Structure formats: C-alpha cells, structure tokens
C-alpha cells in the first residue's frame, strides 16, 4: 500500500492487476482490500464479498461501493439484487441499498443545514427579465437548505418567466428540495397546471433534486419518470433529456437508451430540442460496460442520418464519444473510426488520448510525446490534467501548456482549463489561471464576456472571497447593467454562495481511485454551455455543476451499523451522528475491513464496551 | 482560415515593425540613469552614474504609476530621452540569503513541542493557507507571535516547517547585521529589509535570534549607546508606523526577550507567547530513529537504553551521539557500530564542558 | 498599447533640440545671471525667448543648454531631497471613529488642528493665535499612533510621516539638511501635516561628557528648532510631537513657542474601557446577550494594547475548546491568558515613564 503505488517521480498503479492470477481461488481479507480499490476490476470488487463471510463486515464494504459506483453501479448490485439476497457470498440487504449511497442520509443531512442557516440574498425582485438572474443565485445559494416563503408565498420569480427561463426557474426549487426523501411531490405544483413551459421545469427541478440516488429510496418513482424522454412538445423535451439523464446516471436500460438514439440522430431543434442529447449518453452510461453505444453514434456522425445538417452537432457526437470509451477496453476503436471519417480540430488530440481507460492508466512515454505533436488541440488538455494529479513532473509543465492554450477561436478550450484547475484550486490555489482570465473576460463579443463570468465561478465555486480575493478584481468589472445583464453578472457571484459559502469540491475518493460519475460532469459542461456561447440553446445548462457536486457527510454508525449518535472523534455541527456534516477527517480507529476516512463503521476489542 | 489570416498575419507583422521603431528608441545610442522626481508636464530629471543632468519627455509602454523616485530608468544617448521604467539594474543580488522558497523540513525533528506547535499553526499557518477561517467568522488573525525557550529546541527549525506547508517566501533577519556600525546606517538597513516584503507580499515575516547590543558582546561593529536607541526602535515603528491589516505578520525570536525593551515587544501585534521546553522521552525515538534509520547496530544494542540515559539534552543532542559513535567505529573500519562505542557516546556527551558546579550544592 | 499616439509628435519635440538642457543653480541675479552648474561650472546668461524676468529667482534650479548655455525653462528648487519624497502619503485607514470611547483626547486634539484647516474663519473673529504643536506622549501600548492618523483622514490633505531615527544620517551634518527638507515642502504644499515618530532618539539634553562621539544627535535639534521658531517666525502647518519617552527629551522642548496644546494619554477607567470592546463587538462574532462591561471590570487596569487582544484571543478558543462562536466561557478564558497569563514581562503597566 505504501510501497507500489510510488516509489519513483511517476506513479504506476498497474501493478494490481497481475495478482488476479495468483490470488484468483485464494485472495485475503488484506489482499481483497487493495483489489477492490484503485482499480477496482469487476472480478476484484466481488471477491472481498467472498472472501468475508461476516453480513456486517459487508456493509462498510457497501458504503465505499456506493462512492466507487465504476463497476458495480447499474442493475446487478443495485436495485433488485439489491433489495435483498440470501446466501454466503452476497449478502445485500435493504439498508445497503439506502443508507450507504446518498438516499437516507441525506435528508437527515438537510435538517442540518437549517440551523446552520446564513445571511441570504435571495429576493424575487419584479420583471422576469431579472427574475432568470435571482433564480440561478437561488439555486446553489439555497441548496441543502430548505426555503418555503420564496416557493410558495411569491410565484412573481417564477410564474412571470416563460419559454427557458420558466424551465430554469423551477431548477432552483428542485435545487432547494434537492437531497430530500421525496422531490417529486414537492414539484407537484408547476408539475401540470395549463403549458407545457410550467411542465417543464419540472422534469429539471426534479432531476436535479434526484441527483445521487437512481432508483429512488422507498419508491422506484424515477423507473417510472422514464416515459417523459420522448415527448412531441417543445420545451418539455428539452428539460427532460438533460434533468433526468443527471437523476438516470447509474442506471443502464435499453429503453433510456433507445429513446436517445433518434432524438440524436435527428437533431430537431424546435421540436425535438436536442442539446444534451449527445452527453445524455455519456453521463448516464458512465461506467458502464457497452459495446453498441459507440457504433450507433459512429454510424450517425459519417452519414449524418435523418435531417442532421449543421457540422457542430456533427463534432458534439464525436465529443460525446470521450466519456463513451471510459472503461471499455478495447472497444475504443469505434471512437478512431469516426476521427478518420470527418477531420474537426478537436479530434486530433483524441486519437492520443483513447488510451488513458485503454491501457488502465495514463503518463505513458509516448502519450506525453504525441501530445507535444498535435499541440505544436482543445482535448489535449483532458489528459495533462489526469497527469497532474499522479505526477508533479508534468503539473509544473502544465501550468506552461494552459496559458498558451487559452487563445483559440472556439470557446472549448478556453473553458476547459479554468475546470480542470477550478477543482483542485481549492487544494493547489494558482493564480497564473486567473491572470489569463483578464483578456478571457473582455476580448470581442459580449457573449464571451456572459461565458467568461460562470467559468471564473467554476474556480472558486463553494467558497466565497477567500483565496479569490486576486480573481475578485475580475469580477469587480462586472456589476449591473440592465435587466438582462443581471443574469450575466450573477454567474460568478451565484457559485460562490454555494453551500452557504463553504463547499468541498472533489471528484475522487478515500479509495484512491476517481469517480467516473463525477468525471462525466466535467467533459458534460465542457462540450456544452453553448447558451452563453453562439447559438443560444436553452438556459438550463447553468444547472448541470449539481451532477458533479459530492455530498458531504460522515455516518456515525454502532457496531452493527444502526443510525444510532455514537461519540468519536469529531469532523468539521460539534456532535457527529448519522448524516452528519464533516469533510476531510482521517480515523485512526480500527474497523472491520478496507478502512477508510469519512464513512466508516468503528469497532471496539472485546475487552472492554465502547462505541470508539 | 479566415480568423486566423486576420489575427495571426497581422500580429506577427505588427511585432516586427515596433521592433523596428525601437532602433530610434532602444537602439546602440543607449544609456540608463538614476531617476529623481517627475512632474505633471511628462518631464522628469534623470542622472546616470557618470553624474549628467537630462531633463526630457516619456516615452511609450510606460505610465507614472510605475515611476518612483530612487529607481533606475532607461535613457538615450543622443536623443537622450526616457524609454521606461525598469527592475534594480544588477538587481540587489539578494536571492537566496536569509530568505527562500519552500525550505525542506518535517514535524518530527520539532517533535515534543506538540502542546506548543498548535499555538503557531493557528496563529500563523491557518490564516495565510485558509484566509476563509477568520473572513467568515469576521475574527482577526493574530498579526505575530513571539518565541521564547531555551536554545536547542529547534527554534528556527519551528518556523521552518510552516514556511513549507504556507509555500510562501520565508523571511529572516540576523541581530548582529542591523547594528553593524559605519556611520549610523543601524536603521538605513532596517527599512531595506521591509521594503523588498511589501512588493511582492510574501506575507512572511520573522527575525532569527534577537541580539542587537544588550552589553557590548562587539568589537568590529559597535555603534555607541546610540545605536541602540535607533535600532530596537527602528523595528518598533515598522509596526507602529504602518497599519497593514491582513499582509505583513511579523514574528519576533531570540533566546531571552525579558531584557528587550517592552516597547519593542508591541503589545496587541502579538498576542501568543510561545516557550519552549526539552522533549520527553517519548518524543526521543523519533528523532533517534531518523539518523539510526541508516546506520548499522549491533545485536546488543538496544534504542530504548540511549532514550533512557538522555537526560536534560537538545534535538542535536540526540544525532551528536550517534555522529560520536559512528566516527568510533570509522576509525577501526567496521560494519556495525558495537555497543562499546553506543556506551562511550552517552556517557561522555553528558558531561564534558561543565561537569560541577564548581562550589557548594547547586 | 499606445505604440502610434505618441511617435507621431516624435518629429518635433524629440528630432529637434530643446529638452536636453543641463540642469544648473542660479547665484547672483543682477538686474547678468550667475549660475552654476552641477559640475562646479559658472557662467553668465540673460534671458530667454519665453522666460520671464520674474520667474529667475535667487537660489533655485535653473536648466541651461549644453552646446551654447541660455536660460530656456525653470526647475523645480531643492533636487537634492529623495527619501523625503516617499513620507508623503494619500488616503490613511484608520478613520476618525475607530479610536475606542469619545474622550478629552480626541476634543482636544480636533479643535487645534481640525478646526482651523476647516474653518479657518472661526477664529478670525476673536483675532486670536492657533496653537501650531501639539504635544501626545503617553504610556506606549494605548494606541497614540491611532489617534494621529484618525485627523489625517478628517484632513484630506498631505501626511508627512518623519520618523526619529530619519533625521540621524550616515553623513556628519546632513541631518541638518533633512530638517530642512521637511519645512520646504511646508511652503511648497500648503496646509498639509508633519508627524514625528519617537523623537526620543534625537531629541534630549545628553549635557557633553561620558561618550565624546555623541555630539552628532543633539545637533539635529538645534536646527530643528531654528526651522520652526528661528530669527524669522516662520511657519503655517502644525506640528506634532511624539514619542514614548518624555522624560528623556530635551528640559527645553516641553516648553512654550513650540509646543501649546499638551495632551498625555491616561489608562481608560470601567467607562473607558467598556467602549474598547464595544467597538470591537460590531467584528468577529458577540454571542446576543452577552456583556462586555462585567468583563472590562475583571481587567485591571493597563494599556489600550492588551485590550484588543482580549477580542483577538477570543476567537482563538473555539477552535481549541470546540465551540461555534465566542461565547462568555471563552470570555473568562481570556482573562487568564491575555492578562493572568501574560503578567511576564509583554506589558509596560507602570514600566516607563520617568526611568
């Protein structure tokens, strides 16, 4: 464990894989903890369940399971073999299908966040031309915490905004209900009342508030939801691909797949409405096994089937493709037949990089090679990030290669840099990012100006001023202008009330492995956010950081797990109990295996009676 | 094709023709100077080393806001006029001396002052890595802390593992430096030092054993009983002369500040006082380790006999006999260190300088 | 930018020769200009094409061609002067309701400086004389610096900050041209403000024997004094006199002609130190329901410094005790730290004041 990973400059974690072969009919209740993790191969993650007999030493192996989704997520695990087995080498009850995963805890972690309530800014204001601007601060302002008078009381926020801006509306109430038992009934109120603008902001405020759990808690209520993907209305169809593919992720079905097959082949805008209809594949299938996902889209990228026309839909398929090949094997050569089919500037830097799930890793001699090769182009950037990380050879180069690459045409790369840094700016701050943001903000339309100001939040989305203080000068350039430049203005200033101004942002987990899940929301933003580009879409695209946001909690649980307060070392509000709000805590407890930091199930030696 | 013949053509065409400009400008008739003052006029009065008198206009690529008077500007040698603003020409050659980057040190050779390493980490480490701690809760971070113990403890080595984690500049002072005696020139030194941190803002400030003159101690560079009148309250107006609410911490250290001038302590700048004892015996083994991690012992040696012995002794103390030691078993050329030369080190570290008190009990 | 806006007039104010002219002092006015250049150089001179024979004056800066010497533009007097020009600032923090309490301090002080700069008419009528010093001493630790910068911002004018090791030099008798420096910019910016900064350094009566190579710090004084009151009575700004060591300053400059106003700061009684933390309440986090005045009566009493560090430690404890914000437990816990806790040392409480 503290040996392999690194011993050198570089990291190589491959190592892992050849003990399958030795450990196949034998493995260890040691050794299946070190498989199940990092890598997390299929065949491994099922042999700590056989190798431990123990039901309840079974349960903290679910609450890890749950944060590692990658290979067991869609049905098999969860759902029916997870409402409940009996025999030796499974043993998945009703409690690992809830309090494990987001569903139980995190309404008890909701009432937590009442208590701890701040100063708000959130007002209804008159017009609803300003009404779009105070809903997209409602949204991550309010989240976790549960507000009524806005909702209820003052419907002029909401009932005043029509077409789009009546859809992003309701997204900030799903946001306000989101992490709750029950987010569908909460919405009953827009969910049918005459047009189908009101319905439709149901469908997001609902696929935002299910975020987390895909099979619902006491309910399948999202099995159901399924029926509402292929509607002929206009605007309903267009909250319905992107709200619910973010409550679908986890969830492989041949019905939500064949239903995205026409609506992305086609291409209807007035009708159809097909924005994210690419990346709905991306985000719900990550993590997934699918061979067949990558050849319907390879076949309507070269003939361009039904009435697609217009080659930026035709290079969107071909980036939807990237989180398509993740895990897949080698399956990626559906992804290098459409490269060579239609030459885009972005697919010359993905032929290089197919190889980071391909080979089970990345940092290689020659991919660091082809990249220098291509570069001297958008995508390029994907795979020196996952470099960074692991390796502190290239972070220092790359703080060289994404200055220069900022300066293109296309808006691609100049969102992807500011992300990919966004998220570990809270561990790493770097102010070289934020210096290139200056000629980012003004440069010729006004447009790229209403960009710039949401990816500044991105950086610093969670925390408020702070470290920020340097990027701040930025956004004092920004203030008001008129009624629609409100909403320009509050991009930035909406994420960084988010959490009531403290958020964690992390992709990974304490099992030393990223979350693909949460990784399919970073590619998500990047291939689109075309609203505030040319070509205006639809304004919902703002709401999709809440399907890379992680919650934040740690279970206090007894020696069989039960939801019951036990005294320990405390986190981050001064009692820790089931659901409670902590964030990067380390335990020094022992407990029953793959011991871990955050949830975790502590026992005590027999000769005393503790709850430690 | 049609954006990047109507960006990138003529960005690299405009590059060439402003370097071509410069001839006339930055050309072979080119000189430097030393600026005086400026004046709203575009006008200004420079003189280079040579001593010349040049009274001409400003130039383009530079404003007055970057013009200060005491700095070194670029002229012409014909036209003589002033092309911009530039850095100490040579630069001061400060670098690396009493400051750095990110110095390489851990908590484990500081270890046994855990009780009092917790007081330095949140008045120091958590405001500058965390700002979010006292913006949010509206606290004000402690602007300084003071040190204080006996020599040994790793004094310098404390605030030398927070410069690593801050990745920050670490700043530090000699006492004996600010009082070096030419003519005057105690508080000329002082304000130097405190001018290069307010550019760049490393937000670091600390001063390496407190000495200046308490009596004497000097023989090169004195400075009368003047000297310490205008240095102990030269540091005293960096902080009483400047209110700087979230920037500058000055951190004072030295072996004794009892005999400092209560005014020079600065009440209200810092409010953590930080003394320092010996480690424990427990805290031992982890320094001991360290050094023996790579040294070969005997089957008869034992670690927790040389922990035991250790009584009343510094952090260098713990690697002094294991330095002892290993040169014992150089000298005869041989593999393991026997436990002979483990006995001969503890016993004679102990006692060498002082072995009696010389008169009565105590 | 700007590369093309400016090279357009670089055929006529650059090609031609007008600028380069060498910068020289003008002696002798006889109305013939004797001036001297700075490479120890005299001549003799008129007029130029658009120099008026009222702006030569005697003793002052005068630029002269290098090739055939003619008087074309005046300078700016007094070149020489650099590290003055860097004690001028612009827009102080410290405002007028930051010092803690309203007391005899701040009336005082507002009246002698404030009031004439802002209504200079008031006492026009009465036909009476201004106090030009003031006098703050004090105990050290109570915040006199505080309450300095506190008129600054009321003024809004020109803040010259001298400190009292500036005036010794590295040079014998150019201490004596630094006093200098200080009172002629009085003349050029008028209305602005000089403060001293522990005068106590140069300031004093040493008497002569027992050092021999102390006779350079009591010479500074002596022309400090003939710049403020000499043969000629000049002078229009105030002045302000402060340092943490009266008794040790000179027996003479106590005394009236220079300094008028003597204000000496006192240790806040109960009323005075319940507005320290009062002004304090409005940051960090007050728990509603507590009261800082039954916490002021623990503190005995002692300097402003210690203070504002029971505010500052409060804080300090709910990350080490586990509490959310500072409640009054915290409160009573400071008491022992900031006061009982630091009773060695860290503290003047009756220290120095006369020895």
């Known amino acids: 464990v503290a040996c392999v990973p690194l011993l050198p400059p570089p990291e190589d974690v491959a190592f892992l894989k050849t003990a399958y072969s030795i450990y196949l009919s034998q493995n260890e209740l040691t050794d299946a903890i070190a498989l199940a993790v990092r890598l997390g191969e299929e065949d491994m993650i099922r042999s700590v369940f056989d190798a431990t007999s123990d039901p309840v030493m079974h349960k903290q192996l679910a609450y890890i399971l749950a944060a590692q989704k990658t290979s067991f997520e869609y049905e098999g695990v969860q759902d029916i073999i997870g409402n409940g087995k009996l025999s030796e080498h499974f043993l998945y009850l009703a409690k690992e299908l809830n309090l494990t995963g987001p569903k139980v805890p995190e309404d008890i972690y909701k009432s937590h966040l009442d208590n701890s309530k701040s100063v708000f800014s959130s007002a209804g204001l008159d017009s609803a031309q300003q009404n779009l601007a105070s809903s997209f601060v409602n949204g991550f302002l309010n989240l976790g915490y549960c507000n009524d008078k806005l909702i209820v009381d003052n419907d002029n926020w909401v009932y005043k905004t029509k077409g789009d801006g009546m859809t992003s509306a309701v997204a900030s109430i799903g946001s306000i209900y989101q992490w709750n038992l029950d987010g569908l009934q909460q919405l009953d109120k827009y969910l049918y009342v005459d047009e189908p603008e009101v319905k439709a902001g149901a469908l997001l405020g609902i696929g935002i508030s299910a975020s987390g759990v895909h099979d619902g808690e006491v309910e399948p209520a999202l099995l159901l939801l399924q029926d509402y993907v292929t509607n002929p209305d206009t605007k309903i169809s267009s909250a319905a691909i992107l709200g619910l593919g973010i409550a679908f992720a986890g969830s492989k079905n041949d019905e939500v797949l064949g239903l995205l097959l026409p609506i992305a082949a086609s291409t209807d805008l007035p009708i159809e409405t097909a924005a994210m209809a690419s990346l709905a594949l991306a985000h719900v299938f990550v993590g997934t096994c699918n061979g067949d996902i990558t050849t319907s889209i390879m076949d309507n990228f070269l003939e361009r089937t039904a009435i697609e026309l217009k080659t930026d839909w035709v290079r969107f398929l071909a980036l939807a493709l990237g989180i398509l090949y993740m895990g897949q094997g080698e399956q990626v050569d559906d992804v290098l037949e459409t490269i060579s089919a239609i030459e885009h500037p972005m697919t010359s830097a993905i032929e290089v990089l197919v190889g980071s799930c391909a080979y089970t890793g990345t940092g290689d001699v020659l991919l660091i090679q082809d990249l220098l090769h291509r570069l001297t182009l958008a995508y390029a950037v994907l795979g020196i990030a996952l470099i960074a990380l692991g390796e502190d050879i290239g972070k220092e180069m790359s703080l060289r290669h994404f200055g220069h690459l900022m300066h293109y045409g296309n808006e691609h790369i100049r969102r992807m840099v500011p992300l990919a840094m966004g998220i570990v700016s809270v561990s790493d701050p770097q102010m070289k990012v934020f210096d290139t943001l200056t000629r980012f903000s003004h440069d010729a339309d006004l447009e790229v100006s209403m960009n710039s100001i949401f990816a500044m939040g991105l950086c610093g989305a969670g925390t408020n001023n702070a470290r920020l203080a340097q990027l701040l000068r930025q956004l004092a350039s920004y203030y008001s202008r008129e009624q629609d430049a409100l909403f320009i203005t509050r991009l930035a200033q909406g994420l960084l009330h988010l959490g009531k101004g403290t958020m964690t942002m992390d992709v990974f987990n304490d099992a030393h492995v990223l979350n693909k899940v949460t990784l399919a929301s970073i590619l998500t933003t990047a291939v689109g956010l075309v609203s505030p580009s040319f070509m205006l879409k639809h304004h919902q695209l703002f709401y999709m950081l809440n399907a890379g946001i992680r919650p934040k909690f740690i279970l206090a649980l007894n020696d069989e797990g039960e939801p019951i307060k036990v005294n320990v070392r405390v986190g981050q509000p001064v009692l820790l109990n089931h659901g409670e709000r902590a964030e990067l805590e380390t335990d020094e407890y022992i407990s029953y295996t793959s011991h871990i930091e955050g949830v975790v199930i502590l026992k005590k030696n027999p000769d005393y009676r503790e709850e430690e | ?362 | ?355």
């Open chain 2, 1 to 362: 094709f049609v954006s990047n013949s109507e960006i990138l053509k003529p960005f690299e065409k405009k590059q060439e023709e402003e370097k071509k400009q410069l001839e006339e400008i930055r050309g072979n008739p080119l000189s430097i100077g030393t600026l005086e003052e400026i004046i709203d006029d575009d006008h200004a009065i420079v003189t280079s080393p040579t001593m010349p008198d040049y009274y001409v206009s400003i130039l383009s690529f530079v404003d007055k806001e970057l013009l200060e008077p005491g700095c070194s500007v670029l002229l012409h040698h014909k036209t003589m006029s002033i092309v911009g603003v530039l850095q100490d020409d040579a630069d001061p050659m400060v670098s690396v001396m009493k400051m750095d980057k990110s110095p390489t040190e851990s908590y484990s050779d500081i270890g046994g002052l855990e009780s009092q390493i917790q007081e330095i980490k949140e008045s120091v480490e958590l405001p500058l890595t965390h700002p979010e701690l006292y913006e949010e809760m509206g606290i004000k971070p402690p602007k300084g802390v003071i040190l204080y113990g006996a020599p040994g403890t790793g004094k310098t080595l404390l605030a030398k593992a927070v410069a690593n984690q801050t990745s920050a500049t670490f700043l530090r002072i000699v006492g004996s430096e600010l009082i070096q005696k030419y003519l005057g020139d105690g508080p000329r030194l002082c304000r130097q030092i405190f001018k290069v941190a307010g550019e760049n803002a490393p937000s670091i400030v600390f001063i390496d054993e407190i000495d200046a003159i308490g009596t004497k101690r000097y023989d090169s560079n004195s400075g009368g009983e003047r000297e310490i009148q205008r240095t102990m309250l030269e540091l005293l107006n960096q902080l009483d002369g400047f209110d700087d609410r979230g920037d500058v911490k000055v951190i004072m250290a030295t072996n004794k500040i009892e005999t400092l001038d209560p005014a020079l302590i600065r009440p209200g700048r810092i409010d953590r006082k930080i003394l320092f004892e010996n480690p424990d015996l427990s805290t031992k083994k982890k320094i001991l380790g360290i050094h023996t991690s790579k040294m070969n012992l005997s089957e008869d040696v034992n670690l927790e006999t040389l922990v035991t012995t250790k009584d009343d002794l510094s952090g260098a103390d713990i690697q002094a006999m294991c330095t002892e030691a290993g040169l014992l078993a150089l000298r005869e050329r041989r593999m393991q260190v026997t436990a002979e030369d483990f006995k001969q080190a503890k016993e004679r570290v102990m006692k060498n300088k002082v072995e009696e008190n010389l008169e009565g009990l105590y």
């Open chain 3, 1 to 355: 930018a700007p590369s093309h806006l400016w090279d357009i007039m670089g055929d006529r104010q650059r090609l031609g020769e007008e600028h380069p002219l060498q910068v020289a002092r003008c002696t002798k006015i006889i109305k013939k200009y004797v001036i001297n250049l700075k490479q120890i150089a005299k001549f003799v001179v008129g007029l130029g094409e658009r120099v008026s024979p009222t702006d030569i004056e005697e003793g002052m800066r005068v630029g002269v061609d290098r090739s055939k010497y003619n008087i074309e533009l005046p300078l700016p007097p007094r070149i020489d002067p650099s590290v003055t020009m860097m004690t001028v600032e612009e827009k102080p923090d410290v405002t007028y309701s930051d010092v803690g309490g309203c007391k005899d301090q701040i009336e005082k002080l507002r009246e002698v400086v404030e009031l004439p700069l802002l209504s200079p008419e008031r006492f026009a009528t009465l036909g009476i004389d201004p106090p030009k010093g003031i006098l703050l001493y004090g105990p050290p630790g109570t915040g006199k610096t505080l309450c300095a910068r506190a008129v600054a911002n009321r003024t809004d004018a020109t803040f010259i900050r001298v400190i009292g090791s500036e005036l010794v030099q590295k040079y014998v008798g150019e201490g004596a041209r630094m006093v200098r420096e200080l009172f002629e910019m009085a003349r050029t910016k008028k209305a602005c403000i000089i403060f001293f900064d522990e005068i106590d350094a140069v300031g004093g009566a040493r008497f002569d024997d027992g050092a021999g190579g102390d006779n350079e710090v009591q010479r500074t004084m002596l022309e400090l004094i003939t710049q403020l009151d000499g043969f000629d009575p000049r002078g229009n700004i105030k002045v302000m006199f402060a340092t943490n060591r009266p008794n040790t300053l000179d027996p003479a400059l106590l005394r009236p002609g220079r300094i008028d106003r003597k204000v000496e700061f006192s240790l806040p009684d109960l009323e005075g130190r319940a507005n320290i933390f009062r002004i304090h309440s409005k940051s960090m986090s007050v728990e509603r329901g507590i009261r800082w005045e039954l916490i002021s009566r623990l503190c005995p009493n002692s300097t402003g410094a210690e203070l504002r560090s029971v505010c500052t430690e409060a804080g300090m404890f709910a990350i080490r005790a586990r509490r959310k914000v500072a409640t009054e437990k915290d409160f009573l816990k400071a008491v022992d730290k900031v006061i009982s806790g630091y009773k060695k040392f860290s503290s003047t409480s009756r220290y120095m004041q006369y020895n």
